[PDB]
């Protein structure tokens, strides 16, 4: 359940100042009738930053063209499955595709504007010549 | 005695193929009537390249504004004087000043033009930034 929603229980997890989040399709300000919270063993809260980071990581490392909700699910799973051991199995549901987010997190400009990416993080992975200026080239 | 000239004795010293040299004021293709070679203990041959190098060294290090002929004398002095020990004294005659050679060896272009200097040899003493290009500067 993303931060800013009230679905997650116990209620102590929902104590946050903001109720606006960029992730789409999950989280609500009310408990839907169809939702049976009694069968959910445990709940985890997630934030937009980790969701989009994990979605990008999924796209780049596994080839799964998924959206933000999938990123949130995988981010929660990497924490929850720590209690598991070898020979056990985990399953995560990836709801939607990246077609609905082409100009959203899939775009670096949007993430930088929203603050989910930092110049330090973006440039740390870049090669040595990334910061050299154009004038250093041989050009005429 | 400069190379090409025949003032030096024994005659075996004067066995060289070129009869012309850049240095001025010393050396002739004949023995002057006033020259009494008998009072000279030893003779040395000299060339332009070493003479001008010492002349520049004299100016750059000893502060002596003397011509190439003075450089020739010192160029041989460092070789002949090696037989002397501490407490002994050596005297070198410096004929004339640098005034008569401004466009000559005093000019780096003239030395490079005559081949007495090499680009790699000359530039090896220059700072590390010597071979960088203008485009690398910050300019607007």
Curated annotation (Swiss-Prot), chains A, B:
Tissue: In the adult strongly expressed in liver and pancreas, some expression in heart and brain, weak expression in lung and kidney. In the fetus, expressed in brain, liver and kidney.
Recorded consequence of changing residue 56 to C: In CBSD; protein expression is comparable to wild-type; loss of activity; absent capacity to form multimeric quaternary structure
Localization per record: Cytoplasm; Nucleus
Substitution effect: residue 96 to N: In CBSD; has significantly decreased levels of enzyme activity
Annotated consequence of substituting residue 22 to K: In CBSD; no effect on cystathionine beta-synthase activity; inhibited by AdoHcy and impaired activation by AdoMet; no effect on homotetramer formation
Coiled-coil ranges (or none): none
Annotated pyridoxal 5'-phosphate binding sites: 69
Consequence when changing residue 104 to N: In CBSD; moderate form
Domain of life: Eukaryota
Signal sequence region: none
Disulfide feature: none
Disease: Cystathionine beta-synthase deficiency: An enzymatic deficiency resulting in altered sulfur metabolism and homocystinuria. The clinical features of untreated homocystinuria due to CBS deficiency include myopia, ectopia lentis, intellectual disability, skeletal anomalies resembling Marfan syndrome, and thromboembolic events. Light skin and hair can also be present. Biochemical features include increased urinary homocystine and methionine.
Family listed: Belongs to the cysteine synthase/cystathionine beta-synthase family.
Assembly mode: Homotetramer.
The protein's name: Cystathionine beta-synthase
Organism: Homo sapiens (Human)
Region of the whole protein represented: 281 to 420 of 551
């Amino acid at each position: 359940d993303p931060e800013g929603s009230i679905l997650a229980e116990p209620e102590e997890l929902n104590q946050t100042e903001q109720t606006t989040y960029e992730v789409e399709g999950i989280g609500y300000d009310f408990i839907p009738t169809v939702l049976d919270r009694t069968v959910v063993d445990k709940w985890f809260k997630s934030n937009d930053e980790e969701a989009f980071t994990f979605a990008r990581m999924l796209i780049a490392q596994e080839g799964l063209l998924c959206g933000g909700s999938a990123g949130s699910t995988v981010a929660v799973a990497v924490k929850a499955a720590q209690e598991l051991q070898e020979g056990q199995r985990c399953v995560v549901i990836l709801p939607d595709s990246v077609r609905n987010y082409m100009t959203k997190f899939l775009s670096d400009r949007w993430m930088l504007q929203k603050g989910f990416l930092k110049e330090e993080d973006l440039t740390e992975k870049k090669p040595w010549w990334w910061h050299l200026r154009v004038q250093e080239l041989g050009l005429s």
